[PDB]
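Example 9 (inverse folding). The structure is encoded as follows.
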């Protein structure tokens, strides 16, 4: 018998997948999570007592981004082991393909929070290998279900590439992506490339965006904006074609932007 329901903050959320919480936790009808320190508890009564005792009102680590009430905390897995393990167990309830939960020392975790008077409430996160031999700028990326399809996933994608830009490198999410993750990356790639083409080789777009040439090419191919000539992909678009795509309905929701001026981060 697995965890199938959690209470976190003011949300109740049904599980999507098995997560390896200890057996005596899974047997409970519901798992209760502190939204600030991510301690998981078996009972409403232990949860209530914890909420009156727990002093955390935001993630640990350093706040590397803050604009208005949107915040990102960078949490090193070796410095905040228990917190990152609890985050990975929570994330695994909603990710099919995540496989690492307890060996969190090789990872850095970027926690997205939405702030009010009571504290900084967790929306989602992405993990990132401190040293990625494969050039992955995201390992896992997860938005909690009640915040999905509301701009927060796009924010975290954009954020991951802003880190890659500051590292003077290109990067790509680790595969396989969740179904919603695939749609989200394709939408983000399309809007970023189209806006750059409206305002350039494939290599130029890559240096400007930190999107890999492969991801640029596959995105341009889905837009039918690339020709093939003697073994080379070449951009083939008219400014008018770019503008038709850009004012289609899917590019109409006003994003939460990543303001590079509010990003406080030096590359390792
Ligand atoms: C639970 C497992 C994975 O959860 C995820 C993972 C990712 C990467 C997401 F992007 C989202 C999400 O919520 N996307 N919707 S979006 O932010 O409005 C958005 C609009 C336009 C372009 C991009 C994104 C959820
Ligand atoms: Na639910
Ligand atoms: Zn707590």
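The amino acid assigned to each position is listed next.
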């Amino acid at each position: 018998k697995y965890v199938d329901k959690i209470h976190i903050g003011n949300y109740e959320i049904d599980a999507w997948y098995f997560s390896p919480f200890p057996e005596d936790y899974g047997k409970q009808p519901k798992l209760w999570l502190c939204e600030y320190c991510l301690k998981y508890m078996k009972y409403e009564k232990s949860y209530r007592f914890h909420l009156g005792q727990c002093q955390w009102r935001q993630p640990p680590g350093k706040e590397i981004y803050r604009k208005s009430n949107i915040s990102v905390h960078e949490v090193d897995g070796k410095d905040h082991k228990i917190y990152c393990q609890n985050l990975c167990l929570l994330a695994k309830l909603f990710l099919d393909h995540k496989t690492l939960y307890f060996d969190v020392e090789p990872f850095v975790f970027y926690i997205l929070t939405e702030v009010d008077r009571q504290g900084a409430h967790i929306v989602g996160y992405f993990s990132k290998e401190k040293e990625s031999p494969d050039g992955n700028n995201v390992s896992c990326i997860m938005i909690l279900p009640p915040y999905q399809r509301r701009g927060y996933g796009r924010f975290l994608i954009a954020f991951s590439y802003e880190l890659s830009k500051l590292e003077s490198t290109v990067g790509s999410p680790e595969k396989p992506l969740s179904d919603l993750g695939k749609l989200s990356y394709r939408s983000y790639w399309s809007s970023v490339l189209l806006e750059n083409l409206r305002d350039l080789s494939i290599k130029d777009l890559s240096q400007m965006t930190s999107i890999t040439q492969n991801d640029i090419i596959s995105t341009l191919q889905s837009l039918n904006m690339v020709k093939y000539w003697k073994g080379q992909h070449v951009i083939c678009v008219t400014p008018k074609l770019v503008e038709e795509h850009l004012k289609s309905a899917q590019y109409k929701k006003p994003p939460i932007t990543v303001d590079s001026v509010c990003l406080k981060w030096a590359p390792p």
